[PDB]
């Protein structure tokens, strides 16, 4: 809402497309940019306003980038957790945090392509009352 219209009907978007300001080395990068942003909704400024409501029509605004992060983010955290727990079994744990043991890390880094499958499998994520409880309350 808020006086939000499609692009082509909006005169502001039609004017900004002329002033290209080509980003990349390609001469037609500016024209290709504005043509691609024709799909989005444009306000009085002509700048596209993205709707992150959750509409399947506007899924590319937030929904598709959103899933792309969490798959990557869980890859990073799940790899760091498994590498950290693996170090704990070895003798000198503090040194491996600094000087990484690639024999342990790189196999673990290879995994994580399916972290949710492993995550749901571990219903015991190490949580107990045996942790740092730290004066009485």
């Amino acid at each position: 809402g808020a006086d939000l219209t499609p692009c082509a009907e909006n005169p502001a978007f039609q004017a900004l497309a002329k002033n290209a300001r080509n980003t990349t080395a390609d001469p037609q990068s500016g024209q290709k940019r504005f043509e691609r942003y024709s799909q989005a909704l444009c306000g009085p400024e002509g700048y596209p306003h993205l709707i992150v409501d959750g509409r399947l029509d506007r899924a590319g605004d937030f929904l598709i980038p959103s899933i792309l992060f969490l798959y990557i983010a869980g890859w990073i955290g799940w790899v760091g957790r498994a590498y950290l727990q693996a170090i704990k079994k070895d003798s000198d744990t503090e040194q491996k945090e600094i000087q990484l043991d690639l024999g342990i890390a790189l196999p673990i880094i290879a995994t994580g392509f399916a972290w949710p499958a492993a995550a749901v499998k571990e219903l015991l994520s190490g949580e107990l009352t045996a942790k740092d409880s730290e004066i009485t309350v």
Binding site: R21, N22, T23, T24, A25, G77, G80, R81, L84, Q85, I87, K88, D92, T93, E94, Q95, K96, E97, I98, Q99, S125, G126, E127, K131, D132, E134
Partner: protein, 740 residues
Amino acid sequence: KARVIVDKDPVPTSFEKWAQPGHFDRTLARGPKTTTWIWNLHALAHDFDTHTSDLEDISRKIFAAHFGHLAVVTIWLSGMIFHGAKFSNYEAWLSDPLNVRPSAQVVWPIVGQDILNGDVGGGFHGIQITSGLFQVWRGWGITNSFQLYCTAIGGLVLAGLFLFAGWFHYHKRAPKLEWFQNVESMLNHHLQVLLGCGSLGWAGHLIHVSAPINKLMDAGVAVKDIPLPHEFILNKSLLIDLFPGFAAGLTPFFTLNWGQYADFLTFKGGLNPVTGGLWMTDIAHHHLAIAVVFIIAGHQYRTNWGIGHSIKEILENHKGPFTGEGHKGLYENLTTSWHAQLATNLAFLGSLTIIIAHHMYAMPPYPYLATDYATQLCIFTHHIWIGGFLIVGGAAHAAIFMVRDYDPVVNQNNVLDRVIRHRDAIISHLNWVCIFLGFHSFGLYIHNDTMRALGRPQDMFSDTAIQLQPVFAQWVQNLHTLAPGGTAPNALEPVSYAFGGGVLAVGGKVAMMPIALGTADFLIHHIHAFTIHVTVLILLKGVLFARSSRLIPDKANLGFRFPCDGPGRGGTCQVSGWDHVFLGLFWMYNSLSIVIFHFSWKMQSDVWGTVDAAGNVSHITGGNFAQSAITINGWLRDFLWAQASQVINSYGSALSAYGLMFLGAHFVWAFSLMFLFSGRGYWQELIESIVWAHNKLKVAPAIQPRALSITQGRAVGVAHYLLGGIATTWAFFHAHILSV
């Protein structure tokens, strides 16, 4: 006694110590039980005094470390000359220096940096530099890119050559201690060869290469027609036509008929009207005179032939009535502590760097420098800040010498011991001066600010109202204008037109003109002295009270760098010699940030501007400095609010990054206030609760996390506080003049 003694194969060159971190220290070599080990690894990497109790190993590390540093500076310089060759408009600037801006960078055509590649003239789209290397290389006579290309390669070869030296010396051929302690041999060699012969050889350049090339180029001949430097040596007819003094040859030199060389060794004492800059012949006569002085000055000391002084002898003789033994024992401290040497060298080299900037603006020593107002402020502002940093370092190491290397046996009733024994009188009186000035320097601004708001403009301290004229400076100014006639009569023009004379006009721009001094200029000079005095109060107190105090008598055993003693005694917070330096940096800033504005606003208002052929000068801000620089609101209105319009409006232009850099610094600045205002006690408790969450999900780290140390928190803040401050006015200075 000054013989060369060298140990052979001191240490191997194995790569295993790289894998072993913290090898240099014993405690760190054990292991990283906590995160503070990581921060301590960096804070002790260069502190060789802590690694070993052996002075010889410390000296060898230092001598080799300097060589690796010169590699960095040479690589930085070799890249500078390289960018001038490939990514630059130098060849176009040479033909049309006034109407073409200097650029040396090309941002790539990616996400949208390309707007930064603005039209700087000469068919080149790039960032407009302000270092002034275009003016430097022109004075060097570099008229083509290949001459510029070859010089870059030599620096890299020179860089690796320095790098090979530190390897050769630390691993293979280590000098012993007695080689380093020969200070008398060091001073002679550096004075005569490094400073003396280096100046003499550079005069060979000015006489053979630069001045003929410059004398041709400013005369109207194109760079295409200018011969190369080698042709002057082979063919003397071209040189004799420009400088007829060479027809006599070298015979007038040895026969003391030095008047024959007056054509190309002048004492004009002024700027060249064509190119805003000092005469090249005056710079040739310059270095030749100074080289003889340096060559002569270096034979003072003895060095194995019985002819020369012992510095120990001279110092011991300079005792007096008030100073019991005078300078007895200083030679031992200077020869037994690297920190004392670093303190003297930093303190005066920093004061030297400040003295350069004051000279370079009034008498531009390069061609086409004053017309480039962008370069002058950036060149002035840069060195002014560098010297301030180094002076503070001189006080820090002065305290480190005390806590570490001060021996009471050596310093017995000498000039130093006698200073420590009355430290209270030195500081108490300096405390009085800082309070005296701060009232009568800043209070006058408040009185003017109060009166102008009250509607009483006749009660202010101003030029029309009550006026405080700097008669002593006006007095000294008048002498230098009248000097070329009577005192030092051989000079034709006054030394600098800043003192007085006439307006010099290069193109439409004014290069330099007399800087009149009034009540407003009176009102700022003392503000520097006031801020400088407080900076000395903080730093000087750090040196004297580092060993002991009435509050703490055992401050030496704790060390130079400790946060406190404890809560009691009312509180022992920031009592160390380190913490004094931490506070002095804020005052080193406030001392310095006003200096660059006093230069920036005045020159825009009184000196820099455009001049008409009739003789009427239209300055940039139109004399607003006279009446507005006597109130704090005028600085806020006419200097900060007004001149910053180009920065905020820089978006969508080539200067748009300055608007970003002007702003990102403000974030980094306030980010400093986290670490200065806060304390570790809060942060470790917060980290404790966060550690529980990781224990819950079994993501607990092996190296147990710890908050930053107390001294580090103060350190990280002042690092941000300064970086956010300097980076802010850095972009404001750039974008203002780059538009204006």
